[PDB]
Amino acid sequence: ARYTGPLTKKSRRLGTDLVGNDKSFERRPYPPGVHGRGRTKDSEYSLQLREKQKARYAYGVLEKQFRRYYEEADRAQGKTGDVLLQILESRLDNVVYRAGLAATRRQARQMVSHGHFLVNGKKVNIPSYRVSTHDIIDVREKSKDLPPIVIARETFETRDVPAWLEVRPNKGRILVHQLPTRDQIVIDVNEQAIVELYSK
Amino acid sequence: ATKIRLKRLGKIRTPHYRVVVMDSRAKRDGRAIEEIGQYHPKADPSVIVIDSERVQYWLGVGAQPTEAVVALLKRTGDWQKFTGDTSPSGVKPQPERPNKDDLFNAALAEADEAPREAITKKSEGAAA
Amino acid sequence: MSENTAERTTRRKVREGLVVSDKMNKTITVMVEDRVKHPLYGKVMTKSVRLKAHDENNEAGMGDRVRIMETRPLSATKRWRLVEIIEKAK
Amino acid sequence: PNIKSQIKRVKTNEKSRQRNKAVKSALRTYVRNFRRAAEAGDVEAATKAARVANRQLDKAASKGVIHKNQAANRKSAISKKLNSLAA
RNA sequence: CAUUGGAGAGUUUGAUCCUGGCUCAGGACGAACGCUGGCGGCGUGCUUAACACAUGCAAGUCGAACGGAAAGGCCCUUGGGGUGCUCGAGUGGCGAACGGGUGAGUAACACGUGAGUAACCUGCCCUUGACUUUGGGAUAACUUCAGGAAACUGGGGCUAAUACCGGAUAGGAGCUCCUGCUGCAUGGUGGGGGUUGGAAAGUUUCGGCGGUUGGGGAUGGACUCGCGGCUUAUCAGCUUGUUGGUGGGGUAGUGGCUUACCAAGGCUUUGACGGGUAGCCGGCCUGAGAGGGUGACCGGCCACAUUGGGACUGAGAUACGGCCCAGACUCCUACGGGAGGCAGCAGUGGGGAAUAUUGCACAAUGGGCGGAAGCCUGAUGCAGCAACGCCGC
RNA sequence: UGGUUGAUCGCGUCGGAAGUGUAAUCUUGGGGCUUAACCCUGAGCGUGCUUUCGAUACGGGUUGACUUGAGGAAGGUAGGG
RNA sequence: AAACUCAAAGGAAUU
Numbered sequence: 001a002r003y004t005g006p007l008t009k010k011s012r013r014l015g016t017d018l019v020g021n022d023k024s025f026e027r028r029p030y031p032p033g034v035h036g037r038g039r040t041k042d043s044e045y046s047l048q049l050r051e052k053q054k055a056r057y058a059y060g061v062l063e064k065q066f067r068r069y070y071e072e073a074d075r076a077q078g079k080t081g082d083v084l085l086q087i088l089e090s091r092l093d094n095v096v097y098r099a100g101l102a103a104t105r106r107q108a109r110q111m112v113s114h115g116h117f118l119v120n121g122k123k124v125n126i127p128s129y130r131v132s133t134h135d136i137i138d139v140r141e142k143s144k145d146l147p148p149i150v151i152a153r154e155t156f157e158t159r160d161v162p163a164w165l166e167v168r169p170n171k172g173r174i175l176v177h178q179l180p181t182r183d184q185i186v187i188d189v190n191e192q193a194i195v196e197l198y199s200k
Numbered sequence: 201a202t203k204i205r206l207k208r209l210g211k212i213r214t215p216h217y218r219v220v221v222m223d224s225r226a227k228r229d230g231r232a233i234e235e236i237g238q239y240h241p242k243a244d245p246s247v248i249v250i251d252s253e254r255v256q257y258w259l260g261v262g263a264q265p266t267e268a269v270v271a272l273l274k275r276t277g278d279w280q281k282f283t284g285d286t287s288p289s290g291v292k293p294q295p296e297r298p299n300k301d302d303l304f305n306a307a308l309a310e311a312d313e314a315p316r317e318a319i320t321k322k323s324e325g326a327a328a
Numbered sequence: 329m330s331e332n333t334a335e336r337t338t339r340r341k342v343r344e345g346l347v348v349s350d351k352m353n354k355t356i357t358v359m360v361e362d363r364v365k366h367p368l369y370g371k372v373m374t375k376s377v378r379l380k381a382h383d384e385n386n387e388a389g390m391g392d393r394v395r396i397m398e399t400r401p402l403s404a405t406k407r408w409r410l411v412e413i414i415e416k417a418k
Numbered sequence: 419p420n421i422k423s424q425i426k427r428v429k430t431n432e433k434s435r436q437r438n439k440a441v442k443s444a445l446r447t448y449v450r451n452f453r454r455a456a457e458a459g460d461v462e463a464a465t466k467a468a469r470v471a472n473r474q475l476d477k478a479a480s481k482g483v484i485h486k487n488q489a490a491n492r493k494s495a496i497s498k499k500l501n502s503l504a505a
Numbered sequence: 506c507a508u509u510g511g512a513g514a515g516u517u518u519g520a521u522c523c524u525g526g527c528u529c530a531g532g533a534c535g536a537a538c539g540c541u542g543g544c545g546g547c548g549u550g551c552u553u554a555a556c557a558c559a560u561g562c563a564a565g566u567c568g569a570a571c572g573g574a575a576a577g578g579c580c581c582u583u584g585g586g587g588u589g590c591u592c593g594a595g596u597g598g599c600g601a602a603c604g605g606g607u608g609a610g611u612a613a614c615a616c617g618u619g620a621g622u623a624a625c626c627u628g629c630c631c632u633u634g635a636c637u638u639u640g641g642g643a644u645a646a647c648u649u650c651a652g653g654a655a656a657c658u659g660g661g662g663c664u665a666a667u668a669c670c671g672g673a674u675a676g677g678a679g680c681u682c683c684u685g686c687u688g689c690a691u692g693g694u695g696g697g698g699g700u701u702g703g704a705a706a707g708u709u710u711c712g713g714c715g716g717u718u719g720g721g722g723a724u725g726g727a728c729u730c731g732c733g734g735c736u737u738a739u740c741a742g743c744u745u746g747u748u749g750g751u752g753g754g755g756u757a758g759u760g761g762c763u764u765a766c767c768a769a770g771g772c773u774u775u776g777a778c779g780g781g782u783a784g785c786c787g788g789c790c791u792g793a794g795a796g797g798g799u800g801a802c803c804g805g806c807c808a809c810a811u812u813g814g815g816a817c818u819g820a821g822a823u824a825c826g827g828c829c830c831a832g833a834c835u836c837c838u839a840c841g842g843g844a845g846g847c848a849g850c851a852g853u854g855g856g857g858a859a860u861a862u863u864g865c866a867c868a869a870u871g872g873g874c875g876g877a878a879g880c881c882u883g884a885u886g887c888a889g890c891a892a893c894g895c896c897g898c
Numbered sequence: 899u900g901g902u903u904g905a906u907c908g909c910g911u912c913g914g915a916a917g918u919g920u921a922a923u924c925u926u927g928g929g930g931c932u933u934a935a936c937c938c939u940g941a942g943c944g945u946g947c948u949u950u951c952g953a954u955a956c957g958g959g960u961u962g963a964c965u966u967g968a969g970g971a972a973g974g975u976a977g978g979g
Numbered sequence: 980a981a982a983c984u985c986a987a988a989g990g991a992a993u994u
């Protein structure tokens with residue numbers, strides 16, 4: 001119920017950097033496997049499916065839960081892709097990643113599932129915990145000196161925190177100013193393509 | 201006989217009762233003549249909401265309460281208004297009150313010791 | 329003088345119809361027509377039902393437009409009573 | 419029966435059936451006596467029989483062997499017949 | 506004075522366009538099978554044989570109605586005190602008609618929806634007005650006798666009640682006569698008069714708890730009715746208590762419900778009658794919607810309880826764990842005769858592609874009885890089992 | 899199924915009001931289970947029905963006109979009807 | 980009518 005295999009293979013297949021940089025993605029222009037350099041047809045399904053899989057492997061969400069997110073966004077009022085990206089960003093592991101306390105979303109999932117975090121006073125070990133507005137995520141007092149935590153404390157200045165979060169790095173406290181908007185989620189997929197895909 | 205009793209609802213190991221009016225012969229979780237209130241005992245200082253006018257009407261028309269409903273009416277004070285007896289009538293204590301916006305504004309500004317205990321944990325990694 | 333809750337309110341059902349059978353004693357078969365939409369195609373249809381009324385004195389004849397009021401079961405099939413004759417077509 | 423309550427119940431049901439049957443048969447005999455007096459056309463005999471039958475109908479209704487509505491219906495029939503006989 | 510919602514593809518030809526069927530991508534399931542299988546949360550789990558069922562349990566309770574004393578318990582040289590609590594068996598009250606199950610039957614006022622009863626009944630509960638009077642005869646238990654393999658049955662004797670039966674006294678019960686106001690035809694209702702009548706129960710640890718009868722309330726049920734939801738015309742005639750009338754009977758109640766007499770009706774191509782299938786619905790699945798399919802869990806109504814029929818008792822009965830008769834089955838028998846009904850819970854056999862434990866507890870909620878402590882509750886709350894579903898890790 | 903039009907009824911139709919459409923489900927707002935599923939709670943929905951009060955353009959009922967549709971009279975008239 | 984069977988049958992037109 002969690003993808004544990006290599007991520008560079010998925011990034012190469014999907015054609016975009018799922019996470020990180022300056023890595024084995026120097027072989028980017030071609031998917032993994034023996035048949036990587038051949039010319040591709042890329043149907044509309046192919047395109048749509050690529051966008052959906054890009055979002056899925058970026059956020060570490062499997063198909064059933066991603067589908068559930070899709071119906072929630074579709075029911076919600078407003079743009080379906082905007083709401084879907086808003087939900088995926090409101091996931092707690094992504095919140096930790098965006099605040100910059102984790103090197104990657106996989107590391108954020110690791111620490112969240114291991115329970116190194118407090119949500120507004122209550123301990124949460126659910127990576128899919130949907131953080132609500134005005135929430136206060138806190139690092140567990142016992143685990144305020146994790147090696148990944150201190151690496152993040154050394155590196156966060158380079159990292160860019162989105163406008164909808166406030167982070168007290170050394171304190172391990174992520175204040176949620178508001179639930180993010182499409183202009184605030186970084187554009188790296190085609191949510192419109194995903195929405196069109198979930199209609200066929 | 202017409203009874204004022206509790207109709208069980210909710211999950212396994214999580215009961216919420218509806219103080220309802222139905223005759224004795226009816227099954228426990230069935231059609232009720234009228235729904236009077238609710239009773240959540242699983243919650244802190246159990247929630248006890250009883251419609252005073254309706255419960256007074258049904259007591260005056262002759263509905264027989266079950267012992268549980270008698271306890272709830274004692275706590276709501278209805279069991280004293282009807283069948284006047286010297287009982288404490290301990291109207292439910294509230295199950296306290298949290299808040300979110302005030303805490304967020306308190307911490308947004310908290311700043312100071314936020315990043316301050318934060319550089320103290322910097323000294324901690326030093327200690328780490 | 330001071331009678332109980334008067335009015336009784338509770339009014340009974342009234343139907344206007346056309347007499348289609350008067351050849352049994354103290355009984356007239358009344359045909360009552362109603363117009364309703366078709367459930368699927370929406371056209372306004374004409375639904376007709378035969379109602380047996382009780383006509384004391386046999387005062388109504390074939391083709392007479394009559395008014396009937398519902399009653400308690402007066403026989404195996406009669407449940408209505410004649411209350412007036414509106415047009416005596418004859 | 420399989421339940422001792424039900425065995426007790428069949429015994430008491432038989433007992434109550436005996437009691438009720440006796441009372442109903444007495445009621446029928448009294449009403450028949452009144453009917454035969456009425457057919458014979460006597461006035462004093464029919465009056466006495468009607469009084470007896472109505473009293474016994476009310477007594478049975480009180481005892482619960484018959485419903486009070488049934489007692490009232492039979493009494494009404496008897497009294498109407500006696501009135502017709504007198505007229 | 507805007508919308509929350511609609512995707513196609515392949516395949517007839519040498520090629521084309523159209524028509525057109527077929528097939529596929531989606532969703533779903535009370536599913537099964539194959540491979541595989543870590544955990545948790547919440548659900549769900551005989552859809553077939555309404556097939557036949559071993560075993561345990563699923564409806565009892567009350568000594569503050571009664572005689573009592575077979576147990577335990579106190580007091581006494583082992584029996585004895587019924588003496589106090591207690592208490593088998595027995596009378597008596599209430600409950601057993603609820604809860605729980607199943608979907609065979611039913612194409613029907615069964616159900617959905619909305620009304621009517623001036624045609625209705627309603628134990629326990631609430632409320633209000635009157636009352637709770639005077640007598641009597643039995644009987645179970647017990648005892649004795651006889652019969653029976655048993656199930657049990659019949660005599661003799663004996664005994665108590667809130668058991669049973671006379672009487673008196675009580676309206677809004679019958680009949681009848683005035684009179685006020687009135688409805689929807691039968692009528693409803695207020696007032697007065699005549700006449701004939703209808704009840705009851707006592708008990709206590711003195712704190713209680715009960716009895717009868719009028720009138721209202723609440724609750725539950727009953728019947729009637731308008732409208733609505735299958736298929737079949739390769740089913741066209743159906744009906745004779747059938748349709749209506751009058752008198753009687755019956756019933757809680759209207760009614761051919763029943764009966765006697767009289768009449769000849771009633772229904773039907775707008776589909777009667779017959780055949781097929783089916784419990785109905787809130788809902789469920791699907792769908793842009795309109796619709797189409799469906800009726801598991803849960804909830805409402807109905808029907809049924811081995812098959813067929815019948816009543817009895819009761820406030821109330823398709824009376825699941827009642828009775829009677831018959832049929833088919835199973836069991837006991839000393840051959841004379843007896844006993845039984847898991848579509849209650851768990852379980853077995855069987856059928857099947859396929860569906861679980863012969864579990865724990867009355868702690869909670871609900872129910873029955875008791876003045877109460879309390880007793881009973883396979884309702885229910887839980888646990889076991891299965892990736893069967895959903896969700897999370 | 900219905901040409902033009904006067905009057906009237908208010909059945910269809912349309913608009914209010916009251917009653918009903920239990921609960922659960924479902925949609926949605928809040929709340930609780932660490933999240934979710936699930937659960938509680940407020941509202942909507944319950945697409946109808948009954949009662950009642952209005953409106954009268956249209957459909958229909960009742961009733962009266964008009965002649966253009968339709969038919970008839972008189973005259974004319976073609977034809978292997 | 981049905982079982983059964985086919986993945987076409989067919990219309991107009993083009994070369």
Ligand SMILES: [Mg+2]
Nearest residue numbers: 443444446447
């Ligand atoms: Mg005799």
Ligand SMILES: [Mg+2]
Nearest residue numbers: 491492494495
């Ligand atoms: Mg009579």
Ligand SMILES: [Mg+2]
Nearest residue numbers: 517518988989
């Ligand atoms: Mg061809």
Ligand SMILES: [Mg+2]
Nearest residue numbers: 516517518519
């Ligand atoms: Mg080809």
Ligand SMILES: [Mg+2]
Nearest residue numbers: 568592593594
């Ligand atoms: Mg005993």
Ligand SMILES: [Mg+2]
Nearest residue numbers: 227604605606
């Ligand atoms: Mg049932």
Ligand SMILES: [Mg+2]
Nearest residue numbers: 608784800801
């Ligand atoms: Mg069912």
Ligand SMILES: [Mg+2]
Nearest residue numbers: 667668669706
């Ligand atoms: Mg008595």
Ligand SMILES: [Mg+2]
Nearest residue numbers: 613614733734
């Ligand atoms: Mg019908």
Ligand SMILES: [Mg+2]
Nearest residue numbers: 751752753761
């Ligand atoms: Mg008659």
Ligand SMILES: [Mg+2]
Nearest residue numbers: 608609610783
């Ligand atoms: Mg069937």
Ligand SMILES: [Mg+2]
Nearest residue numbers: 734735799800
């Ligand atoms: Mg259906």
Ligand SMILES: [Mg+2]
Nearest residue numbers: 802803804805
């Ligand atoms: Mg059910």
Ligand SMILES: [Mg+2]
Nearest residue numbers: 482483818819
């Ligand atoms: Mg009876």
Ligand SMILES: [Mg+2]
Nearest residue numbers: 601824825827
């Ligand atoms: Mg029974």
Ligand SMILES: [Mg+2]
Nearest residue numbers: 602603604825
């Ligand atoms: Mg039952």
